[PDB]
Amino acid sequence: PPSIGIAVILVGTSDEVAIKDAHHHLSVVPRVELVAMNETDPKSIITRICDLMSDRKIQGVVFADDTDQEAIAQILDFISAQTLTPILGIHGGSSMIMADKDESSMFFQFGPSIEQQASVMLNIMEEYDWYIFSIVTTYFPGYQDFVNKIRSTIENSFVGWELEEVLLLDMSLDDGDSKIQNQLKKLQSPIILLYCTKEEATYIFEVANSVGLTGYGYTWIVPSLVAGDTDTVPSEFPTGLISVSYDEWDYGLPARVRDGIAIITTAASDMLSEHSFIPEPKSSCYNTHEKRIYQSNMLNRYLINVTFEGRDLSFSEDGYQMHPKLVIILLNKERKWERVGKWKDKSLQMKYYVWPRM
Amino acid sequence: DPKIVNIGAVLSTKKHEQIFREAVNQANKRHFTRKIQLQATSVTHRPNAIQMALSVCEDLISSQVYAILVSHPPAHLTPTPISYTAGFYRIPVIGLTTRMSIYSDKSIHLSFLRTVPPYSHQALVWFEMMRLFNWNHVILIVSDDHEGRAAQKKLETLLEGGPKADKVLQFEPGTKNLTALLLEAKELEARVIILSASEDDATAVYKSAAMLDMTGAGYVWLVGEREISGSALRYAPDGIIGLQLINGKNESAHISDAVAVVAQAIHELFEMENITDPPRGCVGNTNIWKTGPLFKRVLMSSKYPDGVTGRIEFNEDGDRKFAQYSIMNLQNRKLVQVGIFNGSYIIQNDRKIIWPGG
Ligand SMILES: *[C@@H]1O[C@H](CO)[C@@H](O[C@@H]2O[C@H](CO)[C@@H](O[C@@H]3O[C@H](CO[C@H]4O[C@H](CO)[C@@H](O)[C@H](O)[C@@H]4O)[C@@H](O)[C@H](O[C@H]4O[C@H](CO)[C@@H](O)[C@H](O)[C@@H]4O)[C@@H]3O)[C@H](O)[C@H]2NC(C)=O)[C@H](O)[C@H]1NC(C)=O
Ligand SMILES: CC(C)N(CCc1ccc(Cl)c(Cl)c1)C[C@H](O)COc1ccc(NS(C)(=O)=O)cc1
Ligand SMILES: *[C@@H]1O[C@H](CO)[C@@H](O)[C@H](O)[C@H]1NC(C)=O
Ligand SMILES: *[C@@H]1O[C@H](CO)[C@@H](O)[C@H](O)[C@H]1NC(C)=O
Ligand SMILES: *[C@@H]1O[C@H](CO)[C@@H](O)[C@H](O)[C@H]1NC(C)=O
Ligand SMILES: *[C@@H]1O[C@H](CO)[C@@H](O)[C@H](O)[C@H]1NC(C)=O
Ligand SMILES: [Cl-]
Ligand SMILES: [Cl-]
Ligand SMILES: [Cl-]
Ligand SMILES: [Cl-]
Ligand SMILES: [Cl-]
Ligand SMILES: [Cl-]
Ligand code: NA
Fold this sequence. Notes:
heterodimer, A: alpha/beta, Rossmann fold, 2 domains, 8-stranded mixed beta sheet, 10 helices, about 25% strand, elongated, B: alpha/beta, 5-stranded parallel beta sheet, 4-stranded parallel beta sheet, 16 strands, about 30% helix, binds a molecule of 5 linked components (NAG-NAG-BMA-MAN-MAN), binds the ligand CC(C)N(CCc1ccc(Cl)c(Cl)c1)C[C@H](O)COc1ccc(NS(C)(=O)=O)cc1, binds 2-acetamido-2-deoxy-beta-D-glucopyranose, binds chloride ion, transport protein, NMDA Receptor, Ion channel
């Protein structure tokens, strides 16, 4: 069987040996090379992947980082779309949900859709009869998909939901006019759903605290990307913060790099065993204006429908994992993120029946 | 020795690079430049998006540019990679000639103003014509893409602010047999038809409308700039009214005004306290420019009345206000100017309008 080149890119300290040791009967076999990378600015990420693609024949990329940088996902989608190369963001910033990927991206992310986390958050509220709430977002892509999902869910519900306020915070401008404070002051609800980036949340919580919305009587629920790396907990995050989370309790990096390589390899085998060809690895990034009509996102049908070793590793067409096991976590009195629920098979299994405090 | 503050530019030709230099030199002559003094740093569009993004890092952000002017090239290459890469750092981008409405989306383009309006803003002119010529009932046909729906959104806002839209019809971009859609329009009483469509799509509409005898007397056709350009012009019914953005394609003019605005804004920025520099280069830098969002506010509030393309202000999206349009009328198959929208007022000239039929 012929070999396809798969680059695995690891940003930040990594048990490269735990990863290699942790990992194919198909029509094609992986030749995996671990690149390590120290920086996650656009230039560093672009040049590194472009150099790989030219100093070697790369069928696909598996990407993992240890940052809280959702921009990495944006960058990877762009790179993927431009070079029509499959990139899997399996951990860290690379995995933080990017809404509205390019039409011709081949970029897939380990972690929950925006719509899925929205529904998980309503399930949490239903469990504890928290029927009265407001939403706060920034303009961070997804924010509409988030608000819509909520609205759509609760307008179709026999339950007595009361969505009091939706706030849209513009943090592309400075806050010298104390504008965002004045918006936050308008919140009355006891539950608050917040959609934004980790770095944005940091600031919003600082302000929210200053006008007395972080204490008892207010509960905030945020999505994975706000919590991000749970070993890193901004000081401004309020105790009693609830988050959905796919950050790597039961599904460890080694096992993901395993599946990433599996997904890409299988996908290629499936295409070859039906079309008698796979897409030729791109010679470079610097000749993609020329080779346009010769390239395709054909390989996507297969990438999103891989079953390997008993697990359905399917993606959505929107580019996220289909059936992730999600952990619900709570930021406790010791400023440590604590596991208080699971979300498994569309059922929510919470720890507490009544929430404790202190 | 003053402090040297770089402005950046990505421009079509080296003639325009030289115009940008001379514009910045003039600003330095015109302003009090003992404390701060500007320096022009520029570059022409690269042949593809990934190369362009890199160039922004290597050539521009490496010089710590406070802002970046961008034009629409002559040959598939958009400002988008410049907006992304600059946006990563919250360095503002000033679009000179880009007119697609998508650039008004804050989620996709954080730090993007422009000195020309999006196409959707042609609704402003339509609306003032509808008041003027007392068209109180209109049909509105629009392409079902971002741009088409942008025009609908914008017109409808002005109507739900009196004239009304009796119906709104959307067609799939790329369709040629629009007889189905236009028959639906034929059956309504309103005989004033407003069209938002690309060149090729407007051609399809124009042909189908002619077969159905909807281009004759009775009917008023009111379109924008794209719909009387190139191949659209070549089938457009006689009597049609359309628009051309005055100086809309004078890169040189918009460089002159852009630099004036940006220069003003820089000096206004440095009246304020605790101004930080942008990051020197991309490599190793992943934090936003702390002062970026403040500088964006300053730019947004920038008023430059005595500008070459008229009165420069920006709306809440950073799109140009007070743009000026030629009101064009197809007469015996020649495009003839019958008036201008001067920013706020319709000024009919002495050349008589000839409607379809008459
Ligand atoms: C696009 O076109 C519009 C309309 O022509 C321009 O807007 C007008 O700008 C002119 C200046 O050139 C303004 O003229 C001034 O009007 C003042 C009174 O305005 C009131 O009344 C008018 C008419 O009823 C209303 O439209 C308006 O809303 C006000 O209620 C006068 O007092 C001014 O006189 C001054 O100048 C003369 C010299 O000519 C002196 O002798 C006087 O002492 C005095 O100082 C002047 O005549 C007019 O008001 C504006 N109209 C509107 C509707 O705003 C735009 O400027 C133009 N845009 C561009 C970019 O060119
Ligand atoms: C959506 C696009 C695709 N995306 C592209 C980014 C990108 C792409 C490729 C490269 Cl190469 C690089 Cl470098 C960057 C834009 C960027 O993600 C904007 O994200 C924002 C928007 C709003 C907010 N909140 S707000 C407006 O309140 O401040 C925050 C962050
Ligand atoms: C990253 O840093 C390590 C040392 O911590 C170094 O050995 C390695 O060469 C660096 N990698 C790059 C791509 O600079
Ligand atoms: C592809 O998806 C189909 C569902 O139509 C299903 O048979 C399976 O999940 C996939 N087929 C494979 C992996 O052979
Ligand atoms: C473009 O604008 C400049 C002024 O900045 C002017 O000299 C030139 O004549 C204009 N060109 C056209 C075609 O109007
Ligand atoms: C910026 O503010 C800090 C905090 O007071 C101060 O130490 C510093 O001198 C200020 N710099 C300027 C240029 O005002
Ligand atoms: Cl590196
Ligand atoms: Cl893209
Ligand atoms: Cl996420
Ligand atoms: Cl962040
Ligand atoms: Cl650099
Ligand atoms: Cl006239
Ligand atoms: Na804008």
